[PDB]
């Protein structure tokens, strides 16, 4: 992973995701007892975004066909980076968190979210 090998957009996306998860882990200690009432909204939004991006990484590979009874999914890298950048823009804040659980793609994301 280096900007010389891969374009700068991918590098920026990776750095932003890394920083977001690092901040979430850092605040985990305080939130472990008190929670978000003591915490400020400027960090509440960060908590929400971290939770959504963490739940989004879940995927349904075809190897679980013998357990879950559902087909697998595959996504090209361009769609993946586009969807992740869109999520990091925070547009998807309105959507419920559970919809991100074990989803295939952004089209399936929207279909599942609007199905509930």
């Amino acid at each position: 992973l280096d900007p010389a090998i891969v374009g700068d957009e991918h590098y920026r996306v990776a750095q932003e995701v890394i920083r977001i998860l690092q901040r979430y882990k850092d605040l985990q200690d305080i939130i472990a007892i008190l929670g978000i009432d003591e915490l400020s909204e400027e960090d509440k939004q960060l908590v929400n975004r971290a939770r959504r991006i963490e739940r989004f990484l879940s995927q349904n590979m075809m190897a679980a066909e013998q357990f879950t009874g559902q087909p697998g999914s595959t996504v090209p890298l361009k769609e993946t980076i586009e969807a992740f950048d869109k999520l990091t823009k925070g547009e998807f804040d309105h959507l419920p968190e559970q919809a991100f659980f074990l989803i295939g793609g952004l089209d399936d994301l929207a279909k599942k979210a609007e199905s509930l």
Binding site: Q66, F67, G69, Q98
Partner: protein, 177 residues
């Protein structure tokens, strides 16, 4: 070493045994790699998404102290989790066959006991169970032979369920509707 050498395990913890429920099985870590060929196809179709539902129930019960967040959005989820948890308990020296247990899991999945109060749900099904033993047992043989839940048996059993529960009284004497 023992977990590394083998595949599949079951976890028992003294906590749930302390709070009162006798079968103390953890729902987040205890897993098994044995495939779907172990279940019968009837069991596969009637039972599904139980582990994930129990896991999310265990996560969401951590915030039961704040009703200002749920606001009639997961009340059904909380109630269904509670009824299922109350269902899973088993008495001592009580052998049970596949037939009545798949009946019970179907009834729990369809949520037809939601109106029944938590305080007697257990004995409820027992009465229901024995009545179905006293009543026609054709459906048991049918699902025992083809190893699947035929639909016609489904309407027959739900009609019998409605008939029984209409004739049922609660612990406090309030009939279910």
């Amino acid at each position: 070493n023992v977990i590394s050498i083998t595949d599949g395990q079951c976890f028992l913890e003294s906590d749930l045994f302390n709070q009162g429920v006798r079968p103390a099985i953890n729902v987040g870590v205890s897993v098994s790699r044995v495939g779907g060929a172990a279940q019968i196809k009837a069991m596969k179709e009637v039972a599904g998404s139980l582990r994930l539902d129990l896991s999310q129930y265990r996560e969401l019960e951590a915030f039961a102290a704040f009703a200002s967040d749920l606001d009639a959005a997961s009340k059904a989820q909380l109630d269904r989790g509670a009824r299922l948890v109350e269902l899973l308990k088993q008495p001592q020296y009580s052998p049970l066959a596949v037939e009545e247990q798949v009946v019970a899991i179907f009834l729990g999945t369809q949520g037809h006991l939601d109106s029944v109060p938590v305080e007697d749900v257990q004995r409820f099904e027992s009465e229901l169970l024995e009545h179905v033993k006293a009543s026609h047992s054709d459906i048991f043989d049918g699902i025992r032979e083809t190893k699947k839940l035929s639909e016609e048996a489904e309407e027959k059993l739900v009609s019998v369920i409605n008939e029984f529960k209409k004739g049922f009284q609660a612990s406090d004497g309030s009939s279910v509707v």
